[PDB]
Symmetry: D2
Subunit: 120 residues, 4 copies
């Protein structure tokens, strides 16, 4: 079975740490991003999400509230287990920027992907 609890890094070098997953599948953690709009401002930021519980290869989502900007990112994906027992999180994300008013809303959402593997 795949539990998101533990430390993970992604293909861009970001690191996240996820705490205990409760019986609802909820989890909290922290996220240290390797990249940002203004990288000189990067600080460790909180995340909160939910994974499925029964499935051996659960889907999940989480939100990262960046502590150094007005933006928010959400990730969703699935945890896969190899024939050798290795775990990979395949994710896609949306990064929402803050804009001044609704006339700028069209430009406020970036999309991307990330693969994560366990630190140790």
């Amino acid at each position: 079975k795949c539990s998101l609890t533990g430390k993970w890094t992604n293909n861009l070098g970001s690191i996240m740490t996820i705490r205990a997953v409760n019986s609802r599948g909820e989890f909290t953690g922290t996220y240290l991003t390797a990249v940002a709009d203004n990288p000189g401002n990067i600080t460790l930021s909180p995340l909160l999400g939910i994974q499925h519980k029964r499935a051996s290869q659960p889907t999940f989502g989480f939100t990262v509230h960046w502590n150094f900007s007005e933006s928010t990112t959400v990730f969703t994906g699935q945890c896969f287990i190899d024939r050798n027992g290795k775990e990979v999180l395949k994710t896609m994300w949306l990064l929402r920027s803050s804009v001044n008013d609704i006339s700028y809303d069209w430009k406020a959402t970036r999309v991307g992907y990330n693969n994560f593997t366990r630190l140790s």
Copy 2:
């Protein structure tokens, strides 16, 4: 200031209730989707997210753990308030399906938009 707490409907007729937002911007709620892969199966599903606290028009994200499928959706967006105090949540979402293994990962993520307005 644009608040997320309350009852919302979107342009597809889905409804959600968001409970009290804590000092860290964290919130829970319940989502009733009007649309699904198998609409006869739809049941109420929990959501968990984070908004920014200081901003008058905060960005936010949340995860919906569907209680009737193996899928997960994440939403991110911004709460806008117009001249008359009317709120709109402008959101984009990713809907993650469960696939059998990593070779099917390519097909697992749907994308879309939703605009939410306050019920009553």
Copy 3:
């Protein structure tokens, strides 16, 4: 049958003209966006795409080469016709910006939606 040829406006006030669709479903046109990173720079920009030919409500895609920036947008969607013969193009888009090298690739893609209706 839902036709793409003609003049269209979207929910943001952008307009486009699509010319004759050939036997392979290929079409050209001109796009005038109402919105840009630098709106004072906006000029008419060419589009080139393909639709399906047999379908009454075809899917399609097209590329807009912005003539005033280094960016490119792609749109994909479907042409729907209601009971009264009114057409709507339901689309999603990706807007690709130019970045300096691959280490910035993560931030280069915006996503959104647009609904188009026929002018006159």
Copy 4:
């Protein structure tokens, strides 16, 4: 300078062949996908797109009209050149399925990524 003319493969094993890029940046070609909704039906399919011309690392987009389904895919991205002169296309895509009517439109768009390198 980066010209899309030539043969490319992506990280999933798909292959595409792009013909001459004209002075407008337009190009045609073919695309043999490694994966599909119904892979037993896969046939070689046409593509049509536009790249930027002046830039050494141009952005671009193209549409693939699948010849074996009612779907359409669009790709957009950028061609990067290494310090060693190696070229990579970094892309994201939207895959549009045909649905019966507008009430199903919400579920019709998948999103993903692909990296391409030259065949030879």
